[PDB]
Ligand binder design. Sequence first.
Ligand SMILES: *[C@@H]1O[C@H](CO)[C@@H](O[C@@H]2O[C@H](CO)[C@@H](O)[C@H](O)[C@H]2NC(C)=O)[C@H](O)[C@H]1NC(C)=O
Ligand SMILES: *[C@@H]1O[C@H](CO)[C@@H](O)[C@H](O)[C@H]1NC(C)=O
Ligand SMILES: *[C@@H]1O[C@H](CO)[C@@H](O)[C@H](O)[C@H]1NC(C)=O
Ligand SMILES: *[C@@H]1O[C@H](CO)[C@@H](O)[C@H](O)[C@H]1NC(C)=O
Ligand SMILES: *[C@@H]1O[C@H](CO)[C@@H](O)[C@H](O)[C@H]1NC(C)=O
Lengths: 332, 413, 316, 353, 134, 133, 134, 145
Amino acid sequence: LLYTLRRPYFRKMENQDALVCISESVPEPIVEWVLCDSQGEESPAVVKKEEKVLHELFGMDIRCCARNELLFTIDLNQTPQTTLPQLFLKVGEPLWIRCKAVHVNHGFGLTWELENKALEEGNYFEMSTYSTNRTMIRILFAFVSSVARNDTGYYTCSSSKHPSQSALVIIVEKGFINATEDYEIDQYEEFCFSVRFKAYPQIRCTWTFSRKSFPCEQGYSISKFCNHKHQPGEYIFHAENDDAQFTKMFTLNIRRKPQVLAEASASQASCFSDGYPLPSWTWSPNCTEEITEGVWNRVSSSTMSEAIKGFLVKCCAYNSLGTSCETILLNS
Amino acid sequence: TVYEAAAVEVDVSASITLQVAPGNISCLWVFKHSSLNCQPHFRGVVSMVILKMTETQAGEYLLFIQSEATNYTILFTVSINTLLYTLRRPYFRKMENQDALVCISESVPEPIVEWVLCDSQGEEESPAVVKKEEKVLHELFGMDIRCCARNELGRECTRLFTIDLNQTPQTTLPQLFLKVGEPLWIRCKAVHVNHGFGLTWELENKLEEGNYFEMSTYSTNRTMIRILFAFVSSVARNDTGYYTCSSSKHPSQSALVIIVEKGFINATNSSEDYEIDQYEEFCFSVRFKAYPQIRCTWTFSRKSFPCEQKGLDNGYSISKFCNHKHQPGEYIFHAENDDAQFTKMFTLNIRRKPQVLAEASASQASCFSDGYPLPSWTWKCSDKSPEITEGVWNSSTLNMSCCAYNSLTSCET
Amino acid sequence: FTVSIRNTLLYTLRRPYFRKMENQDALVCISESVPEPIVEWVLCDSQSCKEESPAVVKKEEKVLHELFGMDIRCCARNELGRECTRLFTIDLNQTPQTTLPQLFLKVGEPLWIRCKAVHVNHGFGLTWELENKALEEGNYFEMSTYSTNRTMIRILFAFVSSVARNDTGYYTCSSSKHPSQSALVIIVEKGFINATNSSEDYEIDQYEEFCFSVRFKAYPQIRCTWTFSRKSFPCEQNGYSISKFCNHKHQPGEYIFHAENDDAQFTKMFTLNIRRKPQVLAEASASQASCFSDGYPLPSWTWTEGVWNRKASTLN
Amino acid sequence: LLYTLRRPYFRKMENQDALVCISESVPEPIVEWVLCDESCKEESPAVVKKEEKVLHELFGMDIRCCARNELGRECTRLFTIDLNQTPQTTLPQLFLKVGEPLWIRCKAVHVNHGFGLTWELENKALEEGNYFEMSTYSTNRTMIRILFAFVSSVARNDTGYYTCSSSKHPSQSALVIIVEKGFINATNSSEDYEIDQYEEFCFSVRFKAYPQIRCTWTFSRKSFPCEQKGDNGYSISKFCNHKHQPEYIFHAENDDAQFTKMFTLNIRRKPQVLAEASASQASCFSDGYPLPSWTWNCTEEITEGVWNRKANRKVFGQWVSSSNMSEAIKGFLVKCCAYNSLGTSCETILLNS
Amino acid sequence: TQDCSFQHSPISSDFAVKIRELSDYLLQDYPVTVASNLQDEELCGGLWRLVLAQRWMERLKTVAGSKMQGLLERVNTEIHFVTKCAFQPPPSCLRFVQTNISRLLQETSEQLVALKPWITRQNFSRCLELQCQP
Amino acid sequence: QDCSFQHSPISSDFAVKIRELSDYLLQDYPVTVASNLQDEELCGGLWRLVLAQRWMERLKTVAGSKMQGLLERVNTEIHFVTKCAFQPPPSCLRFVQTNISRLLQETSEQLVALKPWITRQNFSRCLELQCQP
Amino acid sequence: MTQDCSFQHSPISSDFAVKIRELSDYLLQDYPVTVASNLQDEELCGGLWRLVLAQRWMERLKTVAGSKMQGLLERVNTEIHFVTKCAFQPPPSCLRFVQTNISRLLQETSEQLVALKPWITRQNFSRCLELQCQ
Amino acid sequence: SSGLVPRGSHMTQDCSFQHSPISSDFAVKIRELSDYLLQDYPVTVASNLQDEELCGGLWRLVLAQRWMERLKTVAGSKMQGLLERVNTEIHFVTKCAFQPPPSCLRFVQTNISRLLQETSEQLVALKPWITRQNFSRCLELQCQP
Ligand SMILES: *[C@@H]1O[C@H](CO)[C@@H](O[C@@H]2O[C@H](CO)[C@@H](O)[C@H](O)[C@H]2NC(C)=O)[C@H](O)[C@H]1NC(C)=O
Ligand SMILES: *[C@@H]1O[C@H](CO)[C@@H](O)[C@H](O)[C@H]1NC(C)=O
Ligand SMILES: *[C@@H]1O[C@H](CO)[C@@H](O)[C@H](O)[C@H]1NC(C)=O
Ligand SMILES: *[C@@H]1O[C@H](CO)[C@@H](O)[C@H](O)[C@H]1NC(C)=O
Ligand SMILES: *[C@@H]1O[C@H](CO)[C@@H](O)[C@H](O)[C@H]1NC(C)=O
């Protein structure tokens, strides 16, 4: 039931007080209405009803899904989820905002309003039903057949026994992705790459690295990737919708622990190879502490001197995580 | 009155917190013979946090509330007892008053006793199976009836042994095993249209008065289901034998009862040592007949993985392991029940590919080193230009002071 | 064995009379006639065609039980013909009739006056007043039935076994939910025919539309006949009845109207109409005191040389 | 507008076992089904009318569609053959123009239901789509059965002798005559008649004609319609209001045929001899009779002197005429007589200047 | 205080005809009910049973065919006057016994005949409370 | 005695006589219908019509003067079943109480379904009413 | 002979009291049904005769019950349907019925089944086929 | 008078609904109750309610409401819930001080199926007017005569 081909739209059946799901696709898809008992979820405890025409519009999470393998709510009775919700849509799409309110007696009303102004007669409709003891729930929907710049603005619903809650409608262009890097970690740390983005419509995302591309678990939405497998390199996140694209390059590195086991010396010249992100080198009567000044100057390795006097000499790698060394003889 | 209850177990002298329409709903904590003030937060949550669980802390902790009621009282029992924990499988006992069963599962801590009745393969794994936590079941008709006990240790379940005369003739005479003293329960269900049919039990063929009883009910369009189950309070060697049920409109189905003096695990360990074939789709197997359902574990090197202890259509249960990952070595299967233990060692020798020479040594002579299960080397002199010669030595290495022979190698001298 | 249909030649047909059957509330039609007649009860609506059966109903039974209805009349028919007597009704629902009906009957005959009133519910009564005075116990009876919605029709009949001068007078019925309607009873000693006869002679032009008329108050219903020259034609016979005759055909002469009932007779002579005409003609030349000029002209002027003979249609 | 009133036709409703009346007209007409019971339907108290399109209760004695528009009233009666009933016209003839729909209903009543009905076109079976049978119960467990035979559009092919036989009744038959255009068959001949003076005489015309003809009896200029009444088979039209007035022409015509018959009439009366007249030296009498014949002591002898009789000098205009010089030689009183089938009459004239 | 009396007679003269006409289309053994324990007071007796018979004419109309509804209603009108009075609902102690509809109609006719000479002469105020037999 | 109809005993206006009887009937009058008649594609409707016919006679005995005529008129529509020597019901035949409206409706349905076959089938085996085993 | 009634195996189910309590939960307790007022005292046939009559009521009730009420009635009908296995003769003319609450009918039916449970398979009920009056 | 308004000397009759008390799913709660009811259970309907184009349906709903309460008292555990659920759909009539029925009001016995059907139709017809009309004159139930 993924959002493939043209996403579902809504239309109120002219005959009765009920909604109809119009999802476009080539081959026609499976149109199923799903009403959840709580705010959430897809867990098999809620109610799925494949009918294309829904009559029981009262309920917590109502959403229509188009499948075939090719509803914005304001609860005055409930606490606000976010500070001033934003509803984005492309010009031409149908706006649908359902306002629900629960009161003890039926003595209460619900009203929709724009920026301090009344709503059009063919842009509103209200339903009502009874709950628990003698409770009354009311749904006052507002709808736009085809949106335009004219219809963009702050919509609010107020009740004659409830606090006025609002939401702003943003309706411009045909598709956007708004999202705001190099990293390095020690071989022991648990890390996840992250990307926060506010984008519409629902984007198709892909986390690719070297050639191996893996999909993602997508106010804003945050996509994550944790199967790094401590493998270093460029992890590129490419996300795109119908009228917009995006790509973010993430560099990754490992701990600066130096391996100095690669000792080597040609006759009359010597050096050591250091496998560490940040190497820094150091070259008889003294107990292996006297520093040899040297003649020459010093994932990747690093390299040192030319012979003057023959003896055993130690050479060290230095990094954020201390030191490591190896000793070579200056003979031939 | 309204009063709620809950069981708590004190784990070490540690500091733990106990928490449980957002509005002005009055609160009052009532500790063990002492009062306690409140601090409510919000939906709505109140808490009582204890630092270092002392012998004084342990016991009665009540919490009374008042908002949409005169009294809304809760109570919690904090237990300090120390290590005498148990989880004895559920047993059955018919309620003395009427024709209904009761589940008696013993355990420390006390467990949740839930009855589960679900259709036996229609179309376990609760897709639409019915779970009913009641400890007393009255609707003993139909489906696969099994009771489950769940405490801090885990979940042990006992299924009610059924003989459906209405169901297909099973070409394998079922065996029922149980330890002396345990209660025997064998329910016989038969479905017939018209209600005109009787059911009869016989162990000595040719049963005790207080060992049999029958119930009956109607189904779909005037159908009739009859339950004639047999029960033994405490079994003994006397009660072991072949039990059969016959109906006056159905074919006589039977099952044999085997009494076990103690818990047992019988498993015929065969082959023991094995070898991989690079592409052979193999799975290690173990067939076993054991009374208490055994707890099994497949361990190797240090990595221990549990098992799919599935039952075979012969009486015994066959456990399998396929995630060998072509890794060679000792795969040990340790399985154990309430009064018995078992362990089987499975050796494995895959490799199947020769590994060539690598060492060049001036000391005595150069070395060989071969990674193949039992190689045979020859020392050779006829290399590039031209002989069999002797090589004395103290993967399979060889001092020569060499070519491998296998079934499916090369070197430079 | 001896009841033959061959007997005396007297024969009669006395109009039907009414008599209430024993205790039960039902009426009986007693019509006398030497050859016994067919006694048929007819119940009609707002009547008047006696040969129409889609609304009007005929029931030949001699004993009628369903006395509720608009026009109830009994009819006797036997060889001589068909004489009928209508049951006098007073409908308090029917609009106030600006006429005060008059009921005539010969001393000895039985008086019958049915008062029918229809009210929404049964809550209402009916009462007869013999000129604002009490009625005899054996002279009234009340029947009742339900109609259409929860409607109630009430009948309050008044009857006299044999009438006399004593019983003549103004009868009225009042209802305890309707306006009091009345009718006067006139007793007669022998049948009568009262007619003015104030148009013995008449005069009209050659193309005028005219009908001879006769207004008369007579009882019982008279047998009328308009005879002229030899040709006799029957007639199509406010309180009085007016008989008319229009087929004059501008023919002049004596048109005599003879009307008679069982105990009375009448005859009225209606003289010529005449019209205008010139009509000239010549008579015999061999004549003393004028030759004479005939040719009947017009009643206007009925008929150079002086001294003519006497003229009387023709001028001699 | 071209106003019309085409007679009703029949069509069985495709859905159920019921008939439908299709009458064409401009303006649209009143279509009323009338079931009389008796093959006459003279009056209207026993007769039952049901003005509704499509008749379902097809059982009954005289079923005829009927009624029309402002033009008048045109009716088509459903041809019936009652096997239970007495034979009507022995061998009935059914005439209809090619293209019209043939409809023949066969009704039979039997005590029990054990009986069948069958149609046959002269010892040969009928087509499946040319028949349909219905049945219902009557009085004390009686059963009535109707097996109609129908032709959608007739042709010469369909003309012939049709017979209905029942498996408990006598086989009655009727012949079907198909016609190419309307016809009027009547014994057309120049008929002359002569009444006496007061006798009751009626002019008659027997005719077998289809469709129903519009008739008119005209004389001099005064035209009066006719009682075109129809037991023989043909229809006989009559006219009796002659008023003893002495050419009565009968003009009858249908949609595709015409007819006219000339009837001469006379009044044989006893002669009137009262018209005596005599000029000087010439004397004669005038005789008014259809058959005059003259005769010319006092009035005892016949004189055969002077004559001047009136010969046939009135061809085609021979209706009413008087008749004769009787020249003076000797003066005296003389009698002159008229003679006819009904005796004699005379008058006497003097021979003077 | 609630009174019950008839100044003008509500019983029609042709009631026996409307009952014989209904009976002609009824299956005589159709089950109806009659009170088994009515106290039977010399003034209220027939009136109480007519109230009960009246209650049956309404119940029967609901299960009757198009034309049977008219016959029932026509008999209902003959005894509908009992509803002019505020008769209290039947007491808890009133028991009913199953009887033929022919028996119910016959009894109803008998009650109207006996009630005819007294319907306008008596005060039926005490009949409003239906009473149970000792 | 053999059982077949050469000529159709079912009239064309039977549904009218049943609607007319139903118009004067109290729809909830208790009659009975067979509860365990054997499943027989040929005798089924015929057996039920025989039983419905048996009810039309029983009803006539308790019907009023005018109701007797309506019953008899519907009785004539299904009286043909008596032309056959149908054996008395077996001991195993059980009846269930139903509304007279249901009996009349079913009778109409049985006649409709039987109409096209009444003259084409031999009903000799229907004379013995059978129960479902 | 007039014998043909006995049960070798008990037709009374163990969960019958549950199906009656489930029906009772959806019924209006005051709904009018009937019980025989004149059944002869017989000690063996008594409960069986009343169950036959209660059974006759479960069929009549199903015809006027709603979609879901039909199921509850039928489910209680199955509990006492065994009475139809025997050829019980139609009720006699002398049998009189008295109106009672459907709650009373259901309660009595439950009581009859309980008392009949220990005897249903031990007795010969051939003489019960003819219902008798007192 | 039990404490009348101190501003208007000519009474203070009030009965109107600012917000519609009739729910949109009322026909469902009635069909659900009807599914467990014996359709021929005897209830009553007013036989002589005065013809009043404004109060008519409201008076009958008040009466139907009075029946829902009486029925709950004789209903089984589960039937009580179905009745109460239908009672809530028409309980709003009690928000107004409807006077007790007059002595002239006569009732006729009818099937509970008929009562439920007409209650449904009364709510449907009342739905478009419940908030637009003043029902103050409906508080006194009136008889035909
Ligand atoms: C009796 O039934 C009829 C049909 O329902 C109705 O009668 C009409 O009632 C109105 C209002 O009173 C009058 O204006 C008509 O003149 C009545 N017509 C007839 C034919 O009676 C009414 O419902 C009922 N009541 C009355 C008084 O007739
Ligand atoms: C509402 O209903 C529930 C369930 O019956 C009940 O517990 C609660 O008390 C009711 N509320 C009120 C205010 O009565
Ligand atoms: C029953 O079992 C007990 C204990 O095993 C024994 O003493 C007794 O004899 C046995 N009896 C029978 C009948 O098996
Ligand atoms: C299990 O094995 C033991 C040991 O040989 C034997 O005594 C016992 O009978 C076996 N039991 C079963 C049921 O295999
Ligand atoms: C009739 O007149 C006589 C005269 O003596 C009188 O006695 C009688 O009372 C009058 N009334 C009636 C009704 O006879």
